Design a protein around this ligand. Structure first.
Ligand SMILES: [Zn+2]
Ligand SMILES: [Zn+2]
Length: 574
């Protein structure tokens, strides 16, 4: 461990728990440095009541110190092996080229306290309105400008692993690197292959556009445990963005990168004897600390780099000898300057997910650089060629597939779809304990309106959404977080009529809809074919679902009585 960079944080934690601090020789950490330990100490009722048939669907009901330790042994206690020197030379060249393209029409900048407060306002609200929080933030920034870090420490939670950091550390990351998100550096117009800021209502059109580019099949390979495969070399290559920063901003960003990305200090819970719990203090110099302000943007960047490299190997620009040491590097510069933009426009990359439309199917067996970079494909033998898709409507991307549907008048739209159990299961989860009827119903309304905008083509979701919206007062504003996906843009977070929002999103503002004729009734908005709806998890035709549909108005009346019969309600079912 680099005690010169993490030592201050470990010593600070040790001094805060000095009387219970101890070194456990029987700790379970294999690839993380261990420093010591100390002693340490959910249903949305509205959605549940309106989704009775799914109480026995394991796909729905399925989705702590023991939990944190399980994710360590199953996923995070691993070390990605170093790529060879030539592979590292290619990764650095491609990353340098890509940063220069992304920065051609954009300038890095510091993000402000005002920008952060505005994003928070959408107990974090209490902290941003307290001057003592900003004083703690200022003390840590002063340490950073002096080459020190005292409190940027992760808190592991898990259940993929989720790494939490105190709001002030997240502010310092946002100040230095938030411009990647706020100024849309990974937007498609700026990056060619990125899709940041496109909603699920548009991603399908990107895949359809890619299908028309001449080339091989569409490949959408997943890397097994992407965040654990981000190496110290990937982090150094991502850090090249600091070369485009002015000196003051550069100092802030280098502190975030060096002290919190390239060196990390984490707190993890672990069960101990007699039902007691300990907190372990560990560290490491690689992996992506999933949950950072710029995890998505940096994962998108590095996945773009990986896919450009796999295309160069497929096109026989890179040879086997180049893994050991890159020979004739001008060939890589030429390929990037000549073909890089064309190959970026042949990709759709969102964090660790990608779809590539290579110039031919040599991409399927171009595995040497991919495997040497440790970006090993999930659910496939390491050296077996990839299998691509001939039909863009079957390609998985961002946990969805995309289907062309036809409106009653002959026009077509391209909609997002996924297996329905995950959609209902997520809506049935309420975040945090102590949620009242007002907060629970507003969050149920947000899921229901999101379904009306994006998944209206699924029979069960259109009906369940109409039942939820009929059970929650119409003047209640949808609240909470409907998804963690950057592609759920929140047009459904409104009291504007969802048929109006549907028309704005799918017709008026949809650049892929040439005819702007409005759709004036929900009965003119299509469903998937019954067999497609069933393939993706519908319960149509299943007796408990038929009973639920026939009883739905009774169920809505029951919920209205619970919330209060005096509220303003709208009948969305008739
Ligand atoms: Zn710090
Ligand atoms: Zn589907």
């Amino acid at each position: 461990p680099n005690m010169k960079i993490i030592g201050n944080r470990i010593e600070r934690i040790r001094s805060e728990h000095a009387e219970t601090w101890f070194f456990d020789e029987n700790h379970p950490y294999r690839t993380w440095a261990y420093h010591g330990s100390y002693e340490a100490p959910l249903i949305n009722g509205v959605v549940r009541l309106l989704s009775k048939p799914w109480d026995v669907v394991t796909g729905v009901t399925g989705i702590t110190p023991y939990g944190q330790q399980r994710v360590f042994k199953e996923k995070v206690d691993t070390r990605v092996p170093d790529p060879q020197e030539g592979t590292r030379q290619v990764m650095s060249m491609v990353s340098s080229w890509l940063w220069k393209e992304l920065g051609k029409h954009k300038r890095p900048r510091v993000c402000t306290k005002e920008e952060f407060i505005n994003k928070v306002r959408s107990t974090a609200v209490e902290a941003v309105n307290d001057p003592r929080f900003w004083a703690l933030v200022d003390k840590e920034r002063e340490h950073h400008l002096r080459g020190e870090c005292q409190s940027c420490v992760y808190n592991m939670m898990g259940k993929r692993a989720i790494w939490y950091m105190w709001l002030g550390a997240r502010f310092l990351e946002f100040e230095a690197l938030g411009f990647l998100n706020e100024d849309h550096w990974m937007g498609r117009e700026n990056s060619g292959g990125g899709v940041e800021g496109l909603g699920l209502q548009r991603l399908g059109y990107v895949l359809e556009e890619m299908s028309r580019i001449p080339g091989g099949r569409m490949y959408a390979d997943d890397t097994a445990g992407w965040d654990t495969r981000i190496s110290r070399f990937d982090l150094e290559n991502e850090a090249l963005i600091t070369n485009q920063m002015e000196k003051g901003h550069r100092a802030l960003a280098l502190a975030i990168i060096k002290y919190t990305y390239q060196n990390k200090v984490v707190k993890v819970l672990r069960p101990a004897e007699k039902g007691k719990t300990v907190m372990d203090i560990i560290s490491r110099q690689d992996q992506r600390g999933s949950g950072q302000v710029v995890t998505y943007a940096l994962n998108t960047f590095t996945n773009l780099v990986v896919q450009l490299i796999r295309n160069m190997e497929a096109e026989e620009v890179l040879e086997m000898q180049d893994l050991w040491l890159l020979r004739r590097s001008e060939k890589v510069t030429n390929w990037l300057q000549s073909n890089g933009w064309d190959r970026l426009k042949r990709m759709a990359v969102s964090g660790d997910d990608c779809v590539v439309k290579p110039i031919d199917d040599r991409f399927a067996h171009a595995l040497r650089f991919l495997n040497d970079m440790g970006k090993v494909r999930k659910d496939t033998q390491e050296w077996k060629p990839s299998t691509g898709w001939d039909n863009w409507e079957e390609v998985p991307f961002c946990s969805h597939h995309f289907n062309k549907l036809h409106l009653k008048d002959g026009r077509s739209i391209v909609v997002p779809c996924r297996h329905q159990d995950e959609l209902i299961g997520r809506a049935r989860v309420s975040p945090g304990a102590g949620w009242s009827i007002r907060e629970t119903a507003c969050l149920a309304k947000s899921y229901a309106q999101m379904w009306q905008l994006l998944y209206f083509h699924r029979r069960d979701l259109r009906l369940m959404a109409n039942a939820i919206c009929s059970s929650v007062p119409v003047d209640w504003v949808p609240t909470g977080r409907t998804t963690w996906s950057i592609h759920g843009k929140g047009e459904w977070m409104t009291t504007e009529d969802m048929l109006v929002v549907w028309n704005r999103v799918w017709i008026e503002e949809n650049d892929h809809m040439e005819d702007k004729t409005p759709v004036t009734k929900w009965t003119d908005i299509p469903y998937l074919g019954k067999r497609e709806d069933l393939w993706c998890g519908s319960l149509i035709g299943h007796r408990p679902r038929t009973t639920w549909a026939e009883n739905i108005k009774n169920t809505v009346n029951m919920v209205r009585r619970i919330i209060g019969d005096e509220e303003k309600y709208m009948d969305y079912l008739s």
